[PDB]
Point group: C2
Chain length 496, copies 2
Amino acid sequence: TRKAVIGYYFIPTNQINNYTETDTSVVPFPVSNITPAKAKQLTHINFSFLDINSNLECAWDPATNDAKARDVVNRLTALKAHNPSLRIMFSIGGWYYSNDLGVSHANYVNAVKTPASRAKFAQSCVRIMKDYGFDGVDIDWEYPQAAEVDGFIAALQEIRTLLNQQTITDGRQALPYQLTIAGAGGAFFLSRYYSKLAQIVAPLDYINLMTYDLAGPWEKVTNHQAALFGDAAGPTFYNALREANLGWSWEELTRAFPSPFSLTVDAAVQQHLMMEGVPSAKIVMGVPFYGRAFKGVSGGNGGQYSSHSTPGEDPYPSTDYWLVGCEECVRDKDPRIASYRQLEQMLQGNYGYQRLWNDKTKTPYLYHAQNGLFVTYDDAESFKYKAKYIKQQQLGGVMFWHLGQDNRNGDLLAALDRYFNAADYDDSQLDMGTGLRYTGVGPGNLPIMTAPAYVPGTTYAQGALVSYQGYVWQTKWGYITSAPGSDSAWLKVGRV
Amino acid sequence: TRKAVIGYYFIPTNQINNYTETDTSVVPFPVSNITPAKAKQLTHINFSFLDINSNLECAWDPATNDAKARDVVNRLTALKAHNPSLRIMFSIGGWYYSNDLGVSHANYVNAVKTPASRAKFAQSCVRIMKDYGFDGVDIDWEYPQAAEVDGFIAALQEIRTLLNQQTITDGRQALPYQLTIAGAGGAFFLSRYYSKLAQIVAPLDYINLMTYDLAGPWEKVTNHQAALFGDAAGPTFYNALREANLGWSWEELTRAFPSPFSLTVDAAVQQHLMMEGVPSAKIVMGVPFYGRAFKGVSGGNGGQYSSHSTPGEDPYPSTDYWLVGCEECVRDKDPRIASYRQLEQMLQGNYGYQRLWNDKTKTPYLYHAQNGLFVTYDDAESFKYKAKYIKQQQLGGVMFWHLGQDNRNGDLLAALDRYFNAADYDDSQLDMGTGLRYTGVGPGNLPIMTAPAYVPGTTYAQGALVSYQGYVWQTKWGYITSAPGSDSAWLKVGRVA
């Protein structure tokens, strides 16, 4: 099965209301830049962002010029002429609109509260999809909290029901309408709904993990924002998942969630696979097409794992654009983020940057020794390892934020497509390194094992293994006189 | 309020059938050894054991000569003439009949299954009680678990309802029929029903903790079977309660169940107290009137915490009776257990036992330097600390297994009585020592705390404290924008006044 390649196309309301394909000053990345070749390398384009209004319905930004909006969307859907597998999805949410303190947060909370609120919300998602010509719905609520999860789940189910009916009604069996969500790519936010991952994922074609922003100025120690594997020399974090409402035992929690642990792309993917009912084929790995920059770093590790003096607040609470060479940072008034396109130019401009490589995390980074700058980002090389991991772990594919950040030749997207589909690319010898892998074991990723069948009447010593009801179990202490599943002394450690 | 003093009177079926008060080789401890003085020192005597038969009703072992049984019970209820507060309870169960692999285990499981079976069983309990002249019912199922707990709870509630009505019907308001259970005194068995303790204890007058047998042949390191507090030098154990179906977060389980931990009497009592809805007044501390012996002890620490080579199977497989001076052991064919009466005599003979004391555990032990023997037991001195602990912790009293193992003068029972009631005994300055206390905290013994009210729309740093909906909560990581509650970021750490 072809791996999914999901790229966000983000466009601000002001750029839509002023849409142009001839003036990068107003619209830096017009649809016209997605050439036929890029169109064939993508399987999905997530148009972003729409929101949920006080009427509790899916809707565009109130200031959007609907006529200009329709025209932008029509240019995207026209790209399907170049690739019959392409879907132009639309995304509702995003950090700005849906975070706890975001402008429209109450609407997300409220929209999923009742059967009637959900019905109306779901119906609006499909009407918007049909009216503008989209091929599916992606929800990016960052993020529902424990008490809102059941409602969120019911809303996704409602949408799934309506989309499946629409697919039949429109004769889209060949390219069914889809439903996806952008999911947390780190344990802190993931712990919000982790206990009910199976229910959340059931109605989706894909859960796109935002496995990036795993480091940033809000953290005290500089770090890679999307390390594939862990580096013992880098910071470690509290494993928030051991506090999710799983209802598991101490041994179960401890073996699934070692803490502290390395916040990596591999950790997030494995944490999802540990849950029963979360198929690997639905898990999509997100990657960033931008880097995060820090100032005030020390030496000795090329800028890595250093204290820094970068403001973590948003918006950027200053006017000092200190990321040397970053012209884009000036137009966007923030030196803490830089598109791969801009980073590539910075590197070729003799601005004092050195490109270093961390072979544990399998990610690149820039170090500016003169000014004390550090930049964590991804490139075509880090993408070789991530693509090989996606194939080995049998994941659904890759997702990225965002298309306007790739260079002019579209190298990052082309690389991803190459790694999955080129007949002449062979990564069989690609060395995945010795970086730290996440080793938790949960219900959904237990090893296959064998053991004598449990025998009613037998007394078992500590450490004894038996098979019962399809699993292999082990005793936590001795003189166990009752069966696995009835006597708490047993720990499920293997399957089949 | 007077502390309870509950003593088990255990008599095997063969002893009931051949009952005699003039032949110690037939009946080692007849009821006549319980003088009026001793009767006054007790508040309860638990006659043991009755059982639950295949018809799922409370019943005597079928081999019991019924007339002889009534005569034995009559001798016990006659004791009430000397103490208007004394109750002769009867106990259903015990290890032999009720353990998972015991001869009547299925009858316990099946009797509590449905409303109909529970009604029938409960009625049988009250019928036997009235028929034989008992004053209450004690259930000693060792131990219900899993799916059986809800049924067990419902059966206890039913017996309660029936006893309360029987009390009124018989005009027994001055001495109401009572209901108690013998409860696990160690975390491994306790973990079976721990999550539902409040429900189990609600219909009870008392839950008598079997806070002994915390060490034995079945363990590889020698140790005190009933240490009051922990000795950092002794073995520690896996805290099984952390595996019970509680629904607590990792932090909550870790704070409530330190592991490894010292298996002590104080641990069991505090573990019951960590659960909301379990009043100290209903908790009764059990103490042993017997000791456990081990052979093969390496010397150096008086035989404490040493490897040993004592058989663990039951019955005793050998014929080798290596407990020097324990003739009782010879009669009973087991050198691994001996009554305080017998241990006192062995201390008396010229056998070479050194009576030693562990000041952390507040318990005595014997050490036979010569033959490499170690005996863990309790005596009048260890009872001083346990009795003070009972008073300090506001527990309901003390329970013991069993009356027949006290010395002939009944010194152990008299000591317990003295410590709770004698005007001329004063433990106000008795030093409880520096032994390890159980310090787990569970929402059930959550302290009063004070913090600013949670403010919606605020972002909190790691470790921040706020008050919200009756509790004080702490953040486990930073940038917390969610409200305290089920949300994973907040930890309940205290109660709001």
